[PDB]
Amino acid sequence: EVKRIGVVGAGQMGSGIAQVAASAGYEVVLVDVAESFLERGLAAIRRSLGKFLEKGKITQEAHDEALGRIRTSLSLEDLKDADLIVEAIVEDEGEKRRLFERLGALAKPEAILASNTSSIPITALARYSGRPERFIGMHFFNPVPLMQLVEVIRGELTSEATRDVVVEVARRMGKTPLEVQDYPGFISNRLLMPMINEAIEALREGVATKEAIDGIMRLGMNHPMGPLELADFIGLDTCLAIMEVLHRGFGDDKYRPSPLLRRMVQAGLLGRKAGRGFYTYDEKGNKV
Amino acid sequence: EVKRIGVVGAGQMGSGIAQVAASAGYEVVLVDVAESFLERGLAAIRRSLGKFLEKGKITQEAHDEALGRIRTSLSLEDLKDADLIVEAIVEDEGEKRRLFERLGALAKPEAILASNTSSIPITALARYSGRPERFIGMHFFNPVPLMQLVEVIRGELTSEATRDVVVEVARRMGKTPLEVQDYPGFISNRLLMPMINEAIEALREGVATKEAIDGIMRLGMNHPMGPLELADFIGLDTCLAIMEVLHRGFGDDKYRPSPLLRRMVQAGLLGRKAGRGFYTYDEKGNKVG
Amino acid sequence: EVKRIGVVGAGQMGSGIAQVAASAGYEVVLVDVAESFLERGLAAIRRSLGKFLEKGKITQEAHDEALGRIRTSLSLEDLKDADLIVEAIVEDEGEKRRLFERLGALAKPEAILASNTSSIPITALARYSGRPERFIGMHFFNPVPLMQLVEVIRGELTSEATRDVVVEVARRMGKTPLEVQDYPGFISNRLLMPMINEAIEALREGVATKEAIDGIMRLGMNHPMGPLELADFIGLDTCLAIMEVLHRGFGDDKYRPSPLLRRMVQAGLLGRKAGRGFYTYDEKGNKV
Amino acid sequence: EVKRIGVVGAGQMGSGIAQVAASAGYEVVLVDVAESFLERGLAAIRRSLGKFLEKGKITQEAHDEALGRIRTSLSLEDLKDADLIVEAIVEDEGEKRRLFERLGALAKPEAILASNTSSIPITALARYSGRPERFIGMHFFNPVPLMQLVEVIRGELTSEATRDVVVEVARRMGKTPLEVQDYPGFISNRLLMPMINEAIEALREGVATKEAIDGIMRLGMNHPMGPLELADFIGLDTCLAIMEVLHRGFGDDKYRPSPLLRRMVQAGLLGRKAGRGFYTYDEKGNKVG
Amino acid sequence: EVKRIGVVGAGQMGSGIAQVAASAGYEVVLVDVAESFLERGLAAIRRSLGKFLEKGKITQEAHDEALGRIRTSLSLEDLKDADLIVEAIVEDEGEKRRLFERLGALAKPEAILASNTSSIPITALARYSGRPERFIGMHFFNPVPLMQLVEVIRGELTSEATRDVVVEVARRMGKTPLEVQDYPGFISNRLLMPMINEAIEALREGVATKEAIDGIMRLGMNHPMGPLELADFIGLDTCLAIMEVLHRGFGDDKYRPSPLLRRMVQAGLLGRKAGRGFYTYDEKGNKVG
Amino acid sequence: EVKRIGVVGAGQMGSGIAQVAASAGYEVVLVDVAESFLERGLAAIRRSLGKFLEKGKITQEAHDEALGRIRTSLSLEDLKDADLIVEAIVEDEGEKRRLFERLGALAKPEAILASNTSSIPITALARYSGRPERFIGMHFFNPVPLMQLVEVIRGELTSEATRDVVVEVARRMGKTPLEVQDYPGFISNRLLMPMINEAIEALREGVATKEAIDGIMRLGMNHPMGPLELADFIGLDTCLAIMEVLHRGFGDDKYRPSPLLRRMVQAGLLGRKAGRGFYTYDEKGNKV
Ligand SMILES: NC(=O)c1ccc[n+]([C@@H]2O[C@H](COP(=O)([O-])OP(=O)(O)OC[C@H]3O[C@@H](n4cnc5c(N)ncnc54)[C@H](O)[C@@H]3O)[C@@H](O)[C@H]2O)c1
Ligand SMILES: NC(=O)c1ccc[n+]([C@@H]2O[C@H](COP(=O)([O-])OP(=O)(O)OC[C@H]3O[C@@H](n4cnc5c(N)ncnc54)[C@H](O)[C@@H]3O)[C@@H](O)[C@H]2O)c1
Ligand SMILES: NC(=O)c1ccc[n+]([C@@H]2O[C@H](COP(=O)([O-])OP(=O)(O)OC[C@H]3O[C@@H](n4cnc5c(N)ncnc54)[C@H](O)[C@@H]3O)[C@@H](O)[C@H]2O)c1
Ligand SMILES: NC(=O)c1ccc[n+]([C@@H]2O[C@H](COP(=O)([O-])OP(=O)(O)OC[C@H]3O[C@@H](n4cnc5c(N)ncnc54)[C@H](O)[C@@H]3O)[C@@H](O)[C@H]2O)c1
């Protein structure tokens, strides 16, 4: 039944989702708002599939056939016969709302619509879609070709059938789909971001240096990255937005953002992407 | 310096601290309250040093010399000339208080006293010791011979000199000492335990199953253990006690224990050590069913 | 501006290109698909530099410093910061196309990409690269350490700046760069291969023996090798592929391969590398 | 006298023989029937010499010089001036016969011809060669670069001089040549294979499990591999073929193949190379329980 | 349930079985027919335990306690309350029969009787014992303190319970018990001895020298000893007796002893113990000439 | 303060000294006069570290890191920043003199120079170095990775500081440094070689056979090797050279070489390395 997958957004996540869908044997249409963004997206797909081929993880045939199953477009109308459309556009409720109203109008009636959103309520996006029973969260992990997890998020009205289809797509993509209810932060961000926020509060209070905090979590807890270097990697603007969703969604002070996180974002010290957050980065990323 | 190290408590942590001190070239006196506990402790040390020798991490000489530098005793008086005494007894403020009053009285004036406590304020233990400028937290990670971290916790009155001595001992033990202020949860537990507590709240609220929660944190965040299986490993009684220290010490509802964590502890479902917490364990401590 | 040169293919030509780049003072990253091929390539570089040292063409210092400037790698991503990348992989348009799509995606924007291709249109490879203004033919001659010529081939879109950079690299390598337009056979193969093909036709027609044909061209025209022994040296499969490129590219019967050349290739009589073409060879490649 | 060695067959054994000949300082011409087979052969030689280099058994120079002494060819005529030609082609008497008739015709008169055959009579191959006095068995052990033994097998007509030359080549290859007469199974297969066959019969009779049989021979007799896991390693088709040579060559029921060995081969349960014999193997050739 | 072990025969094997039983924590009564034999037996036990102590494989305490658990006796009646009695007397069916009839009469009803026999059918000895369900083969390997293997041999009537008890005793002795059915040669001798016999036949036929035969099996097959030097080590009289058991028990010419093996035994060339078999030995048992 | 160790001579001793320095955590530069000698040296280091790894005496990490700390070179100038340089070249005073004059000129002023010489006076080599207070004997035992002893030899002018640094390096190498004054034969050779020489004289005089002499010293005195088999192991040329240094240095006939030792050396019967001395050896160096 699922043969054709639409992906909206050829960014960090959408280009990975398009790749894993194509590698699984699905026909893929990847949509964005400018040719330059589509080109940047297929460049990321060629680099990733290229590494899989180089290290003997896939054959020449599978490499070339996967690329052959990806078509790019500037036109949402080219998703009219997709069985599943995965949205991976900017993390902005207004933008996703306008997209899902359009997708609800043009997608064939049996098409499932899915969001890769980190933080926006699945139930709200489901209402904007006009087909809430055929709406679900399909939350991938960065970078998509390397991360086995899909967090599958049921909206209030998500049907059993919708969940079964998306769980099977994840399995065909070589992923482990784990199901969660639509509450603020789902599981992934609800568990991760308050610990990062607590590290930032400990830093503000002078409990320890950034090096001591990151070293304690790496060496003591075997986290691959400490929370402050991880915040820099995610982006401090993204960290703040997720803490605000927890604070506003639970309505509980428990989830208040660190005032130092607010201050860093006001300063534009947004992490690796700005060349500076808690640490300073050179042009390649790497700390200095 | 420091030539002679006392370790009080030949348990899970103290037997590891004794081993790493001995392997570093320090003379060690390991003290407990019964011969059976000392025997269990040196059995753990022989098993660990045995594995290091077998895998070529140490020589026969270093293996034999390390064991040769460890003496056991039932008498605190045998610590009278220790340069550093590390306490690793039961996590109970009253017990540690009575021990530190005794150690303050009998240890030579220049001796530094240290606690491996997970949660009890270093500043309070420092006052009980009678020598707060020569008191410090020296917080090791389980299992001590394998975990490179020492969290070094300054009490209000801990001197620069005391910190310098203990940081150097940790380096000679092959550890990375990272310094933290004496506030509830230090860094390690303040960051870890509220995330475990949040996983337990998500489970109570029906947001996901225990398998989905642990799988998401393992696969998504590359945590070696998910928070619920980790809670079982630490002990749910220990998890609840640390959340209570954060709640009482910060005085902030932010750190309130999950009602499900309280209920599990009331039921005696304490994790691996009880054969059941979030998961069920066999006699070897592996999941079953 | 050019400090770092990538070479893809540690074969007959790529190992020579890597050597002359290293001897010229450039940092070299030499890439192939297996460690054994890289080892075989640096063994050829050590043998050649060893002969240059023995005959007093270079000093011990220059010998050791040249080897010191060559790193081998199985990862194309190690060419991310190369100023110039020269491709010397198998003569197959599909293989080169997939390589150049990958190189275009991973190389820094200012990097120039070049092909050592004998026959494949530079303008086509330039399109596959995604950066045609920064694409050029850089055609070396076998064996690269000994042959002074570089044939520099402008694609339709090759910039003046790209040509200037590659002409300067050739000069720093001690080579004479001579410029040609991207048309079938360039100059080198367009002039050489139809004369070899004509010798094969004269042989098929019974006009003379192979010895008479090669002797006439050696003694009469002062060619170092007659065309039939030269065909055996190049490989009859390579001769046929070049004649096919001339025939298909000009679309002109003038350039039709000799039916005897087709027949020899069907028989696997490919020349020196098969132990037999027009002549019979021993294991060392001498006539018997 | 021996400067130039021909090897026919760039397979498992021939590529090893070529390598050890080249490492010993001989010029080697390695012959096969297709370029792909020659490429596969020199790939195996580069991998092995690469490991010798990595472990400090040889220098970069000796590595490069050894490879420099190996030339490949599709033409038997290129063996016209070889002093010694060692055949390591398919174990098929007809194929070896056609090869040895050709080699006898083209090799210079003083050239010695040798077979690596496991089981075909040396005396018969010697007759096919047309120079039986200059024919001998030179039986190497898998893998050739690692195994010190050469079993040197005299045909009925093999001269003293032929034996002396081949014994000296084996010594220059760093091998221990041990001399045997041309009778079925020589020594190696005559002694080994009937014991493997007996283990298979004991298994068929229900005397013990495969694990008990292999464990008894490993622990009791200090054999590195038990006979059933060894049969799987050799290939049950090869084990059956060698038992048939003993049975037909001695003409004695003493050497009859186990009916269970026949049945396993009829089923295609050939051992490691088929993914299953007595034991089951994964793609890497390790057992799975 | 097994606390007390009887061993009958204080020879090469019985003194080893007594030692490993004592080292495992069992009370041991070691019986023979003369004081000199008992003295020779405990001398071998002191030498072996002495070497374990010197090399630090055991403590002084364990050394002294093991010797303390061994009593010697000339009276079978001293086995009246043994839980397990292991026979290790001369390899003679008549002698073992008379012993087992006596042991069946005097041993307490729940006592298990076991034979270390190399070759005599377990089922026959079981019948002589009068308690076949409580009879089993417990076949140790020379020298017992060093060899991990026990071959456990079920008689036709041996109970599951008897097998379970003897397998557990072997494990407490630090051994690996591997189970086999009572058929001629069990597994160990059925697999080993026909290959030794074949080496002797190849030698008689002039296929190769003794050095070539032993060298081929050492270097080619990674056997620690070649079959001819191994035959000398075992004793050629023992080799012939085991081949006779295979020949008579299977009733199959396949297992006929080599005529050269018979001739060597007729000449008294019995191997190391006679100073000459296939090889010549000095008084220390090293090859000479 | 000692971080970087130079070793000159990649022979039997120098390759062992380089290995033990690298295993102790020092950065090592190993120098010789030809590539083949450096290759033979690192082959011996790989074989030795390989055996330590195989028998579980070291970890994979320690094995790989030790090899990673060794660089080879044909240029003494690469020792310009060594803290300690240990010479282990040919036992020839003229060669060591020319080396130490060069090392004195190029090594940084605080660098200590040490000789592994068996027999040449430390005080003389110290004068050739131009920095006698920073010169010392550091005499290792064959084979270096297995032998715990370092004989530390004070020249007339060797400073306390120089001795302290070299004693500490020996301890970090896992060795037991024992201090001796610079007089002929130091302690090791002064005690050992006259007893070997006496065994040779007893053999020449027909007092006993070589087997009786070696058996008496093994069984009676618990020497692991008898003096004649030991002479074969050391090399009879080395034994003679050491006896000559005792004879010429003390100026005392007491230390005259056995005429049979001179005769054996004149015949080239040098011991294991020649396949024959007092005993005959196979290619593996076992008696025959
Ligand atoms: N980056 C992460 O690690 C990560 C992880 C999980 C989930 N997410 C979520 O995935 C989504 C995408 O994030 P990203 O990191 O890939 O962002 P990105 O900026 O890399 O990509 C966003 C893409 O969407 C395109 N786009 C914007 N508006 C559009 C519209 N109206 N129609 C079509 N295309 C439009 C942009 O041009 C761009 O190509 C967000 O909701 C984010 O919260 C991010
Ligand atoms: N984060 C954690 O996992 C955690 C939690 C709580 C406390 N701890 C800390 O770890 C250390 C001990 O924990 P463990 O897991 O090793 O425990 P354990 O119970 O295995 O060992 C403690 C040892 O102390 C001995 N002991 C008790 N009272 C004593 C006394 N008065 N004098 C001497 N010995 C005495 C006990 O007999 C026992 O051998 C303490 O410093 C404790 O504060 C660990
Ligand atoms: N050989 C000549 O005389 C000659 C003359 C001039 C031009 N050329 C051209 O140069 C090119 C190479 O020729 P050659 O003779 O060196 O061939 P070759 O077969 O010797 O070498 C090709 C190498 O490329 C490697 N390779 C293949 N695909 C690869 C990939 N994707 N990435 C990295 N390495 C890869 C192969 O493993 C091999 O080592 C061809 O385009 C040929 O037409 C050849
Ligand atoms: N593999 C072993 O363990 C082993 C042990 C000892 C002896 N042997 C014997 O060595 C010989 C080779 O065995 P292998 O395992 O190397 O086999 P293999 O199949 O790996 O190699 C045989 C090679 O011979 C080539 N070949 C076949 N017919 C040929 C012909 N007529 N002329 C030229 N080349 C020809 C094939 O192309 C192949 O490359 C056999 O006689 C075998 O019995 C094998």
Ligand SMILES: NC(=O)c1ccc[n+]([C@@H]2O[C@H](COP(=O)([O-])OP(=O)(O)OC[C@H]3O[C@@H](n4cnc5c(N)ncnc54)[C@H](O)[C@@H]3O)[C@@H](O)[C@H]2O)c1
């Ligand atoms: N020697 C081996 O390698 C070996 C291997 C395994 C099994 N076995 C078997 O073990 C048994 C013992 O062999 P061994 O090598 O110890 O022999 P042994 O001759 O060394 O010991 C036999 C002992 O039994 C005693 N003995 C004889 N008759 C007796 C009797 N009626 N009552 C009590 N004691 C008596 C003898 O006095 C002697 O002390 C034999 O059945 C033999 O086949 C021996």
Ligand SMILES: NC(=O)c1ccc[n+]([C@@H]2O[C@H](COP(=O)([O-])OP(=O)(O)OC[C@H]3O[C@@H](n4cnc5c(N)ncnc54)[C@H](O)[C@@H]3O)[C@@H](O)[C@H]2O)c1
């Ligand atoms: N071999 C022993 O058992 C032993 C014992 C202790 C001391 N020593 C002493 O150690 C020194 C080394 O002896 P060895 O056995 O290692 O000798 P070796 O011949 O094995 O090694 C000497 C190395 O020095 C190199 N060399 C020669 N001149 C050189 C120069 N000018 N610069 C750099 N390298 C140069 C040679 O090429 C060779 O690789 C001698 O002084 C010897 O007396 C030897």
